[PDB]
């Protein structure tokens, strides 16, 4: 899971 | 000759590179004829959150390093900032602030800026603009074309590349459309593809997203990044399912790297040698050829075998195939009478793992200093396939029950341990196989006690 999401 | 912009974007959440780091990737960038980069560090408070605040003397210093090398390295250097979290569209005092904060840059020769707005709300959190605009984009529009129309009458072919609130995923967003009718032509728009960090990026879905924006996009593409919470996985497999044709529909490619910048130069290679001729890219050829270069040959069938452990990426998704499909073919051996076979391809392997390890280890680089956390537990997860090993020989044998039960207890150890594991090194593949030899092994235990006459499955007496 990106940072952003 | 196929991208005009051939770019790295340093737009990664976490530790930002040190200035030697970007001096240093700017010379590999020149060797790979890369010619772009975009400093937007997210955890750069005066980039982001304390965007009105201007850099102090110190800092403007090392930019100005930063942007000589560059040119020295025939790289564009753009600064970004993201003032989405607080901007006031509709007031004219905001504006003078974000030109303040560039003028720097614009007097130390920059001409290319980065006003971003990704990862902010969806909608207009200030009243003042909720009375100017009907929504985000046409607020975001309105502010960019007074920034440009500035900036005109300031210097000398200003150009600006802008990130918008909406991304990714869905090409024929009302707010997409409203964009490319209402900013002026030649601001740049980027775009992430089917998702933030895109699996693959088609012709077709960059058509769309060139009909929408009224121009090709900018590709800001999220990969080898590995911020938030991809920071376990190690992206050092190659570029890799980018249409050899984007070109066509695509003005240029920023790749977001790794906060490790020297095992981001892996990919960043392939992603380079893509750029320069899409259409005879390979990326299993040009991983080879990025190893041998940065790495040195010697390291090569290492590098290969390590890997196969480290896939897990948005470009491949799944669970690393050349252990899960080893492991379903060990166990269908041990299934089906065939328990030599077995036993080999796993004794096979596990040389082959601490062969690889014991190599790669040797070397004292820069890159196998940023990748050893991901050294260390591979090589732990090897060490607890050998004790499945011994385990499963044993059993098969049977006297060898002691060192089957041993097997069992020193398993049962390792697996709680390895929750804490901090690396996504083999997945989750290897600890599964692990998890199986112990579920394999119950009945030794109830043989041991000699309850074997009265347990019932799952393995237990009960009334
Ligand atoms: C959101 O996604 C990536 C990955 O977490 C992050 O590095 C980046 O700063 C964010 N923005 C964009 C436009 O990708």
Same mark, same amino acid.
């Given at each position: 899971?990106?940072?952003?999401? | 000759?196929?991208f005009?912009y051939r770019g790295?974007?340093?737009?990664?959440?976490?530790?930002?590179?040190?200035?030697?780091?970007?001096?240093?990737?700017?010379?590999?960038?020149?060797?790979?004829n890369l010619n772009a980069?975009?400093?937007?560090?997210?955890?750069?408070?005066?980039?982001?959150?304390?965007?009105?605040?201007?850099?102090?003397?110190?800092?403007?210093?090392?930019?100005?390093?930063?942007?000589?090398?560059?040119?020295?390295?025939?790289?564009?250097?753009?600064?970004?900032?993201?003032?989405?979290?607080?901007?006031?569209?509709?007031?004219?005092?905001?504006?003078?602030?974000?030109?303040?904060?560039?003028?720097?840059?614009?007097?130390?020769?920059?001409?290319?800026?980065?006003?971003?707005?990704?990862?902010?709300?969806?909608? /207009?959190?200030?009243?003042?603009?909720?009375?100017?605009?009907?929504?985000?984009?046409?607020?975001?529009?309105?502010?960019?074309?007074?920034?440009?129309? &500035?900036?005109?009458?300031?210097?000398?072919?200003?150009?600006?590349?802008?990130?918008?609130?909406?991304?990714?995923?869905?090409?024929?967003?009302?707010?997409? &459309?409203?964009?490319?009718?209402?900013?002026?032509?030649?601001?740049?728009?980027?775009?992430?593809?089917?998702?933030?960090?895109?699996?693959?990026?088609?012709?077709?879905?960059?058509?769309?997203?060139?009909?929408?924006?009224?121009?090709? !996009?900018? /590709?800001?593409?999220?990969?080898?990044?590995?911020?938030?919470?991809?920071?376990?996985?190690?992206?050092?497999?190659?570029?890799?399912?980018?249409?050899?044709?984007?070109?066509?529909?695509?003005?240029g490619?920023?790749?977001?790297?790794? !906060?490790?910048?020297?095992?981001?130069?892996?990919?960043?290679?392939?992603?380079?040698?893509?750029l320069?001729?899409?259409?005879?890219?390979?990326?299993?050829?040009?991983?080879?050829?990025?190893?041998?270069?940065?790495?040195?040959?010697?390291?090569?069938?290492?590098?290969?075998?390590?890997?196969?452990?480290?896939?897990?990426?948005?470009?491949?998704?799944?669970?690393?195939?050349?252990?899960?499909?080893?492991?379903?073919?060990?166990?269908?051996?041990? !299934?089906?009478?065939?328990?030599?076979?077995?036993?080999?391809?796993?004794?096979?392997?596990?040389?082959?793992?601490?062969?690889?390890?014991?190599?790669?280890?040797?070397?004292?680089?820069?890159?196998?200093?940023?990748?050893?956390?991901?050294?260390?537990?591979?090589?732990?997860?090897?060490?607890?396939?050998?004790?499945?090993?011994?385990?499963?020989?044993?059993?098969?044998?049977?006297?060898?029950?002691?060192?089957?039960?041993?097997?069992?207890?020193?398993?049962?150890?390792?697996?709680?341990?390895?929750?804490?594991?901090?690396?996504?090194?083999?997945?989750?593949?290897?600890?599964?196989?692990?998890?199986?030899?112990?579920?394999?092994?119950?009945?030794?235990?109830?043989?041991?006690?000699?309850?074997?006459?009265?347990?019932?499955?799952?393995?237990?007496?009960?009334?």
């Open positions: 899971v990106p940072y952003s999401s | 000759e196929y005009r790295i974007i340093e737009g990664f959440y976490g530790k930002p590179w040190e200035h030697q780091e970007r001096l240093d990737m700017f010379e590999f960038m020149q060797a790979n980069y975009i400093y937007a560090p997210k955890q750069d408070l005066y980039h982001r959150e304390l965007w009105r605040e201007p850099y102090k003397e110190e800092q403007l210093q090392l930019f100005k390093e930063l942007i000589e090398k560059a040119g020295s390295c025939g790289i564009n250097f753009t600064f970004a900032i993201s003032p989405g979290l607080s901007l006031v569209y509709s007031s004219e005092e905001e504006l003078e602030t974000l030109i303040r904060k560039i003028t720097p840059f614009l007097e130390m020769g920059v001409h290319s800026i980065g006003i971003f707005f990704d990862n902010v709300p969806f909608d /207009l959190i200030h009243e003042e603009d909720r009375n100017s605009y009907s929504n985000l984009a046409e607020a975001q529009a309105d502010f960019l074309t007074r920034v440009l129309q &500035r900036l005109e009458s300031t210097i000398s072919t200003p150009q600006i590349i802008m990130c918008p609130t909406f991304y990714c995923n869905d090409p024929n967003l009302e707010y997409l &459309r409203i964009l490319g009718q209402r900013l002026p032509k030649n601001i740049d728009v980027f775009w992430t593809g089917p998702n933030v960090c895109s699996h693959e990026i088609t012709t077709s879905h960059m058509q769309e997203v060139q009909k929408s924006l009224q121009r090709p !996009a900018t /590709l800001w593409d999220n990969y080898p990044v590995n911020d938030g919470g991809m920071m376990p996985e190690l992206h050092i497999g190659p570029y890799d399912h980018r249409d050899p044709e984007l070109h066509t529909h695509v003005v490619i920023y790749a977001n790297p790794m !906060a490790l910048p020297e095992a981001s130069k892996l990919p960043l290679y392939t992603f380079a040698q893509y320069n001729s899409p259409s005879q890219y390979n990326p299993q050829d040009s991983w080879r050829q990025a190893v041998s270069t940065l790495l040195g040959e010697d390291n090569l069938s290492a590098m290969e075998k390590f890997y196969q452990s480290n896939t897990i990426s948005c470009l491949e998704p799944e669970e690393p195939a050349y252990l899960t499909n080893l492991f379903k073919k060990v166990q269908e051996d041990f !299934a089906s009478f065939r328990f030599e076979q077995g036993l080999r391809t796993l004794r096979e392997e596990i040389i082959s793992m601490q062969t690889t390890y014991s190599r790669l280890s040797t070397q004292d680089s820069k890159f196998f200093w940023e990748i050893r956390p991901w050294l260390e537990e591979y090589k732990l997860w090897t060490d607890y396939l050998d004790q499945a090993m011994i385990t499963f020989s044993n059993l098969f044998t049977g006297e060898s029950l002691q060192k089957a039960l041993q097997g069992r207890t020193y398993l049962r150890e390792v697996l709680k341990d390895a929750v804490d594991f901090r690396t996504r090194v083999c997945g989750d593949v290897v600890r599964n196989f692990l998890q199986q030899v112990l579920r394999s092994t119950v009945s030794i235990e109830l043989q041991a006690e000699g309850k074997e006459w009265t347990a019932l499955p799952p393995g237990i007496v009960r009334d």
